[PDB]
Paper text:
We recently reported a flavin‐trafficking protein (Ftp) in the syphilis spirochete Treponema pallidum (Ftp_Tp) as the first bacterial metal‐dependent FAD pyrophosphatase that hydrolyzes FAD into AMP and FMN in the periplasm. Orthologs of Ftp_Tp in other bacteria (formerly ApbE) appear to lack this hydrolytic activity; rather, they flavinylate the redox subunit, NqrC, via their metal‐dependent FMN transferase activity. In the current study, we identified a bimetal center in the crystal structure of Escherichia coli Ftp (Ftp_Ec) and show via mutagenesis that a single amino acid substitution converts it from an FAD‐binding protein to a Mg2+‐dependent FAD pyrophosphatase (Ftp_Tp‐like). A high‐resolution structure of the Ftp‐mediated flavinylated protein of Shewanella oneidensis NqrC identified an essential lysine in phosphoester‐threonyl‐FMN bond formation in the posttranslationally modified flavoproteins.
We obtained several crystal forms of the in vitro flavinylated S. oneidensis NqrC protein (lane 11), expressed in a soluble version minus the N‐terminal membrane anchor, and phased the structure via the single‐wavelength anomalous dispersion method using the selenomethionyl‐substituted protein. There are four independent monomers of NqrC_So in the asymmetric unit, and the r.m.s.d. for superposition of these monomers ranges from 0.3 to 0.7 Å for over 214 Cα atoms. John Wiley & Sons, LtdThe modified threonine (T225) lies at the N‐terminal end of the C‐terminal alpha helix of NqrC_So, in a groove formed by a number of conserved protein side chains. Surface representations illustrating the electrostatic potential of the NqrC_So structure reveal the high solvent exposure of the phosphoester‐threonyl‐FMN residue (47% solvent accessible surface exposure for the threonine side chain; 55% exposure for the isoalloxazine ring of the FMN; 49% exposure for the remaining atoms of the FMN). An electrostatic potential calculation of the NqrC_So flavinylation target site shows that the environment in the binding cleft for the FMN is positively charged. One of the highly conserved residues in the NqrC/RnfG proteins is K207. The side chain of this residue is located near the nucleophilic T225 and the phosphate of the pT‐FMN modification. In solution at physiological pH of 7.5, this lysine in the isolated NqrC protein is solvent‐exposed and protonated, but in complex with its cognate Ftp protein, the lysine would be buried from the solvent in the FAD binding pocket. Interaction with the negatively charged phosphate of FAD may abstract a proton to yield the free‐base form of the conserved lysine, which would reduce the pKa sufficiently to allow deprotonation of the T225 hydroxyl. The K207A mutation exhibited no detectable in vitro flavinylation activity (lane 12), confirming the hypothesis of essentiality.
Author numbering: 0, 33 to 254
């Protein structure tokens, strides 16, 4: 029962994170639960094949646990995000507007910053390139330096940016020179905290890379 309250608490935070990333209004009170239930379709997908896998309670799926279990995980070839081990399946979310048309796909990403693992979600538009929103919800980086990652002021900068170039190659780079509106692959680095930012950069590089959600996206582009 203590289990239920905990799961109930994390499911609420999860629902809010996903809607926030997808730029959907959470409504007032507990309406976010109803909005999520109507406009979001949780999915467990096989990262290698891109196929949808089955689970009785997708929202309660423990991705931390799945990543370390030897029978449901593997070691990445190019461990860019320094995660050491990767789950076979990932939980993703398809988000639809009121018209019922696909609005975005929200996927989990995480990777080592400078001193700790950083966890979050990225919402991408149906072109699977343009970012609809980034939400970081957990980290262990030094407060006052690397804890900017959870600051909405900084996270909002990612909106509208594009992950890949015309060669289909990951192109996002954190920039210190001060990013201009036309720099669609650039995000402002937080001076004095560059190493954390490069971690987030590498986190997305992996999870939108060949060992990440690329197969899954290529499957959606087809059918």
């Amino acid at each position: 029962s203590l289990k239920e309250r905990k799961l109930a608490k994390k499911r609420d935070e999860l629902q809010r994170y996903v809607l926030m990333a997808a730029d959907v209004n959470l409504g007032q009170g507990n309406e976010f639960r109803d909005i999520f239930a109507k406009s979001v379709k949780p999915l467990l997908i096989n990262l290698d094949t891109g196929k949808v896998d089955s689970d009785a309670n997708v929202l309660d799926f423990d991705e931390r646990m799945a990543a370390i279990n030897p029978e449901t995980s593997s070691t990445p070839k190019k461990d860019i995000a320094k995660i050491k081990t990767r789950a076979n399946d990932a939980r993703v979310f398809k988000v639809f507007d009121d018209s019922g048309k696909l609005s975005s796909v929200v996927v989990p990403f995480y990777g080592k910053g400078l001193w700790s693992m950083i966890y979050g979600y990225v919402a991408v538009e149906p072109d699977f390139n343009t970012i609809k929103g980034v939400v970081v919800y957990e980290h262990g980086e030094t407060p006052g330096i690397g804890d900017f990652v959870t600051d909405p002021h900084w996270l909002s900068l990612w909106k509208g940016k594009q992950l890949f170039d015309d060669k289909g190659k990951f192109a996002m780079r954190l920039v210190k020179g001060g990013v201009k509106e036309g720099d669609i692959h650039g995000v402002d680095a937080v001076s004095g905290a560059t190493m954390t930012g490069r971690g987030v950069q590498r986190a997305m590089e992996f999870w939108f890379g060949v060992e990440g959600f690329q197969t899954f996206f290529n499957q959606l582009k087809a059918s």
